[PDB]
Design an enzyme around this catalytic site. Structure first.
Site, PDB file in Angstrom:
ATOM      1  CD  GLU A  61      16.804  16.607   6.535  1.00  0.00           C
ATOM      2  OE1 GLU A  61      17.806  16.854   5.831  1.00  0.00           O
ATOM      3  OE2 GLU A  61      15.843  17.396   6.658  1.00  0.00           O
ATOM      4  CB  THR A  88       0.811 -13.835  -9.307  1.00  0.00           C
ATOM      5  OG1 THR A  88       1.971 -13.485  -8.540  1.00  0.00           O
ATOM      6  CG2 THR A  88       0.409 -12.657 -10.178  1.00  0.00           C
TER       7      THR A  88
END
Ligand SMILES: Nc1nc2c(ncn2[C@@H]2O[C@H](COP(=O)(O)OP(=O)(O)OP(=O)(O)O)[C@@H](O)[C@H]2O)c(=O)[nH]1
Ligand SMILES: Nc1nc2c(ncn2[C@@H]2O[C@H](COP(=O)(O)OP(=O)(O)O)[C@@H](O)[C@H]2O)c(=O)[nH]1
Ligand SMILES: [Ca+2]
Ligand SMILES: [Mg+2]
EC number: 3.6.5.-
Lengths: 437, 155, 431
Positions: free
Chosen positions: A254, A179
């Site tokens: 993790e 856009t």
């Protein structure tokens, strides 16, 4: 149980966040009004889905989500949508005037008029957490709010929550649905200022999702509705380990351990399979070996790049559905020998495997068909540097002529920040080159 | 001095004042600081009657100011078709060149006076005349993309 | 970004400005009294951009009518939508400007400008989120040019964070053979480069040539010319008056269209061309609309876009058509005409499709281009200005109102720098 707060910034982040929470409720069995019948404990719990949902006294399950935009048009649809009663109304924050696709407006001028209100609303959700672990930030690259305000928000979150993790879901610009012409500027600017405040960022290339919708889903002219339904299906697979019991990527820390060897190269590549059109409801169910081989086809990746041109530093395979673990080992052993997949010399050339034995949920009204088994591969490969290269080239073409730069310096921003951001991108490319020997 | 009064009377269009001043010996060929004669100012401001009266009383139709402008230059520039024809009838140099290399055809073409362009062409306007920058009347029409003017210059 | 305050100055500004309200009200389903007669909900979702909601479902245009000549005042009320304008928004002086830029900018118009600012502040405070201001005027006259540019400087110094947009009409000897118009236009262009964010150049030279040569109208009238203007003003404001995502406000349009602050003069184009007598004009196809849009005969400015390069281009398609087919043709014309686009601005062509076509048409294409070929328009005025200024013709009309003659040399020098700046980027390459 460690809670996770999701933050959705800009039109892209709000609409994608809207599709994700609709999918989360279907997977967890949460009614649009917030009631969860299978929830044994009423008024509060300690299950895995509590990381994303808090619980009120009346059994209502409210998402730990914040929706922010500098203009109210997009968020007003959430206030009146199907899940209008699901979110805390004070967690839907809107301004009156947007950033006009300008990074400087979202970061310096317009953005500062609401940044303190957002932090106080986030602090309210954070005070309701027994052990907050981090944030998931959804935003676009090309938008003024998605780029300018996000980098401002990430800077402030590193001050009040320095030890907490911060994961991004970023929307990479594509010319087919772009856009603004200045989206290469806003993408390089927000990457430079957020690179030190984000532990792990999952880029979503709008062009990659656009082509998958045309090829695998037979959609002639895809819209944001079609893209967001496929994006949310991949975000759900990435965050499934945080919302269900499992052994792989059970917390935000993790993710960095398994996917981010060095803090600067924290842009994993995601791949999803299978993507089958809903018009083929009686399709042939693909085997574990078939969907696992599809994870290494470049046509199934969320970012347009060729992993055969790069080296792998990490690789996580998240399965969902009827998946026997011995079939995964056989499918991996074939791939290690058949395909020419090269790991770096300093990483253990192995694969982390996590299996969720529930098939993926499809959204009613979506373009996807029900499948018995699916897989999402998260891998940190150096081939994703091609994505940065395409952006930097478009940046260099315009900045050489100083095109559109006056819009940024006119909103309180030194012109030298362009070259500082561009130089940081040049250093990021060398980091990938220094790894891929 | 009646020279300054005849200059102002010619600029303002005072027909009676012009006739009275000439009867008292006013210099019809008087000049201002830039060399403009009453015929220049009359041709500039469209006072056709004063142009004819001056020409009947010894006005030099080919007088030039400091920049080399004749009354026909200014009449073609401002776009007074009636004065242009009267000047040509009394011997105006149709191909007079000013300090910028412009002929009356140049100024008429630049300002879009297509009727004056036709009248000048009928009286020997050199279409090959170049200004200080090498442009002719035809070059001006092609550069400005004035198809109406380019057709007139082809006859 | 919601409301827009409309201002029209001078005879030409009120002429094309009144025709603008007549056309968009018909599109939004608003009768001359102010009631909503539309049968589509899409006509009121963005109605607050140009209209104010009054009493019993009455919509009043957020317009301000200014002119030093009181004659054009009653000429607006005699029109169709004459009474729909607020009577408080009629600010008219006593005597006309006499085509003198100095009278409108320094003397006569300088007295009435304070009365206009009061009406602007009244409308501005009645807005929830004001986008900016749009102005319609001519550059060849005295009121719309002289007082219009003065009103711009006074407004921009009180509302600096707002977008200044103008619809400026360019003089042409084929329409009005008044020789002081190059003076007034040059002095106004010097003001527009400094105090406007977006300026649509509507060349009367182009309007006349379209009516005369293309539409085959032997004697074009101002009504024939203003028919092309209103059709263009409706097209360039489609994305502002209807729900959309591409250039939905004045600021997002400017950020996509204006790569450099001084180069903010747009070359508008429209397809197909009508001549107030469409009869049974068939709806053109998408490839026909795409090809005809970039045609030199369809531009509202007398410029050949094949003589320059497009810096930025916005295309607006209106009507029922295939979204996929529009994407194919736009990507097709960018390969055929690849050399007419600068290569150092990637993806500089943005396309928007609106479902509601204008009146009397089913397939229309509006073209908004920032092309370096616009220098041909300024060169034409500069040559006419220089021809007059070198002989000092009629220079005392302006110096007799307080103007210093060095303002002419500054306006000439500033406009020549603008031309050289367009040529600078027309020849620049990506190495
Ligand atoms: N996949 C997807 N992409 C989107 C969506 N909405 C916007 N985008 C992309 O986001 C980019 C523009 O950013 P936006 O989010 O629309 O802008 P913003 O963040 O609201 O910031 P503003 O400039 O103030 O409007 C474009 O390149 C779009 O392709 C969406 O719903 N889904
Ligand atoms: N297209 C168009 N041009 C006009 C119209 N009215 C005047 N003009 C042009 O505007 C110039 C005269 O300026 P004008 O607006 O009449 O004087 P003002 O009252 O001082 O602003 C001339 O060159 C005309 O060609 C109109 O209705 N339509
Ligand atoms: Ca519980
Ligand atoms: Mg937005």
């Amino acid at each position: 149980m460690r809670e996770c707060i999701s933050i959705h910034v800009g039109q892209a982040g709000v609409q994608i966040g809207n599709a994700c929470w609709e999918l989360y409720c279907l997977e967890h069995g949460i009614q649009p009004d917030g009631q969860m019948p299978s929830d044994k404990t009423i008024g509060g719990g300690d299950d895995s889905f509590n990381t994303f949902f808090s619980e009120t006294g009346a059994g209502k399950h409210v998402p730990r989500a914040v929706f922010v935009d500098l203009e109210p048009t997009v968020i007003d649809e959430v206030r009146t949508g199907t899940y209008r009663q699901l979110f805390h109304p004070e967690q839907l924050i809107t301004g009156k005037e947007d950033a006009a696709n300008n990074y400087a407006r979202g970061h310096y001028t317009i953005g500062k008029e609401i940044i303190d209100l957002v932090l106080d609303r986030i602090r309210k959700l954070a005070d309701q957490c027994t052990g907050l672990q981090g944030f998931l930030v959804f935003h676009s690259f090309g938008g003024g709010t998605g780029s300018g305000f996000t980098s401002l928000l990430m800077e402030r979150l590193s001050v009040d929550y320095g030890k907490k993790s911060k994961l991004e879901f970023s929307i990479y610009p594509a010319p087919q649905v772009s856009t603004a012409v200045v989206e290469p500027y806003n993408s390089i600017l927000t990457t430079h200022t957020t690179l030190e405040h984000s532990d792990c960022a999952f880029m979503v290339d709008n062009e990659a999702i656009y082509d998958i919708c045309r090829r695998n889903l037979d959609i002639e002219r895809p819209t944001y509705t079609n893209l967001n339904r496929l994006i949310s299906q991949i975000v759900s697979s990435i965050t499934a380990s945080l919302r269900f019991d499992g052994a792989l990527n059970v917390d935000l820390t993790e993710f960095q351990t398994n996917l981010v060897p060095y803090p600067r190269i924290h842009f994993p590549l995601a791949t999803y399979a299978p993507v089958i059109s809903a018009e083929k409801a009686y399709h042939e169910q693909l085997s574990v070996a078939e969907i696992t081989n599809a994870c290494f086809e470049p046509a199934n990746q969320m970012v347009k790049c060729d992993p055969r041109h790069g080296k792998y530093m990490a690789c996580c395979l998240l399965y969902r559905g009827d998946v026997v673990p011995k079939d995964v080992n056989a499918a991996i052993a074939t791939i290690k020998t058949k395909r020419s997949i090269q790991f770096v010399d300093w990483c253990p050339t192995g694969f982390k495997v996590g299996i969720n034995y529930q098939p993926p949920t499809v959204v009613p009204g979506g373009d996807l068909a029900k499948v018995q088994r699916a897989v999402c591969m998260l891998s940190n490969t150096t081939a994703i540097a091609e994505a940065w290269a395409r952006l930097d080239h478009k940046f260099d073409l315009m900045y050489a002529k100083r095109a559109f730069v006056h819009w940024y310096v006119g909103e309180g921003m030194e012109e030298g920040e362009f070259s500082e951001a561009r130089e940081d991108m040049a250093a990021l490319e060398k980091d990938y080159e220094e790894v891929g020997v | 001095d009646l020279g300054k009064k005849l200059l102002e009377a010619a600029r303002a269009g005072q027909d009676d004042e012009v006739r009275i001043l000439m009867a008292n010996g006013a210099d019809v060929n008087a000049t201002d600081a830039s060399g403009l004669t009453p015929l220049h100012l009359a041709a500039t401001y469209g006072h056709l009657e004063i142009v004819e009266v001056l020409l009947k009383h010894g006005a030099d139709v080919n007088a030039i100011d400091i920049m080399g402008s004749t009354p026909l230059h200014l009449a073609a520039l401002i776009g007074h078709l009636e004065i242009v024809e009267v000047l040509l009838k009394h011997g105006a140099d149709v191909n007079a060149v000013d300090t910028w290399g412009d002929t009356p055809l140049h100024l008429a073409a630049i300002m879009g006076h297509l009727e004056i362009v036709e009248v000048l062409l009928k009286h020997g306007a050199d279409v090959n005349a170049q200004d200080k920058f090498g442009k002719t009347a035809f070059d001006i029409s092609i550069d400005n993309g004035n198809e109406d003017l380019a057709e007139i210059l082809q006859k | 970004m919601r409301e827009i305050v409309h201002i029209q100055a001078g005879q030409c500004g009120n002429q094309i400005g009144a025709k603008f309200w007549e056309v968009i009200s018909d599109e939004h389903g608003i009768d001359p009294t102010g009631s909503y007669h539309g049968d589509s909900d899409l006509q009121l979702e963005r109605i607050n951009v140009y209209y104010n909601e009054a009493t019993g479902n009455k919509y009043v245009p957020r317009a301000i009518l200014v002119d030093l000549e009181p004659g054009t005042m009653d000429s607006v009320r005699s029109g169709p939508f004459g009474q729909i304008f607020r009577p408080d928004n009629f600010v008219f002086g006593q005597s006309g400007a006499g085509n003198n830029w100095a009278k409108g900018h320094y003397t006569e118009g300088a007295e009435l400008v304070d009365s206009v600012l009061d009406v602007v502040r009244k409308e501005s405070e009645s807005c929830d989120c004001l986008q900016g201001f749009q102005l319609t005027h001519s550059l060849g006259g005295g009121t719309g040019s002289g007082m219009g540019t003065l009103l711009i400087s006074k407004i921009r110094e009180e509302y600096p964070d707002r977008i200044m947009n103008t619809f400026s009409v360019m003089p042409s000897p084929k329409v009005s053979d008044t020789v002081v118009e190059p003076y007034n236009a040059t002095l106004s262009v010097h003001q527009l480069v400094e105090n406007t964010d977006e300026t649509y150049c509507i060349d009367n030279e182009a309007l006349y040539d379209i009516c005369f040569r293309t539409l085959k109208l032997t004697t074009p009238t101002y009504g024939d010319l203003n028919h092309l203007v209103s059709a263009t003003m409706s097209g360039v404001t489609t994305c502002l008056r209807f729900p959309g995502q591409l250039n939905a406000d004045l600021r997002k349009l400017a950020v996509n269209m204006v790569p450099f602050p001084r180069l903010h003069f747009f070359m508008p184009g429209f397809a197909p061309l009508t001549s107030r007598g469409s009869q049974q004009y068939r709806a053109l196809t998408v490839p026909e609309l795409t090809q005809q849009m970039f045609d030199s005969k369809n531009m509202m400015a007398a410029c050949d876009p094949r003589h320059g390069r497009y810096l930025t281009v916005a295309a607006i398609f209106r009507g029922r058509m295939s979204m996929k087919e529009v994407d194919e043709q736009m990507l097709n014309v960018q390969n055929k005409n690849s050399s007419y686009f600068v290569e150092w601005i990637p993806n500089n062509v943005k396309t928007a499709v609106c479902d509601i076509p204008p009146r009397g048409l089913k397939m229309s294409a509006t073209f908004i281009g920032n092309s370096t070929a616009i220098q041909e328009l300024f060169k034409r005025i500069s040559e006419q200005f220089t021809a007059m200024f070198r002989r000092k013709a009629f220079l005392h009309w302006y110096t007799g109102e307080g103007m210093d003659e060095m303002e002419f040399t500054e306006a000439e020098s500033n406009m020549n720098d603008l031309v050289s700046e367009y040529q600078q980027y027309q020849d620049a390459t990506a190495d």
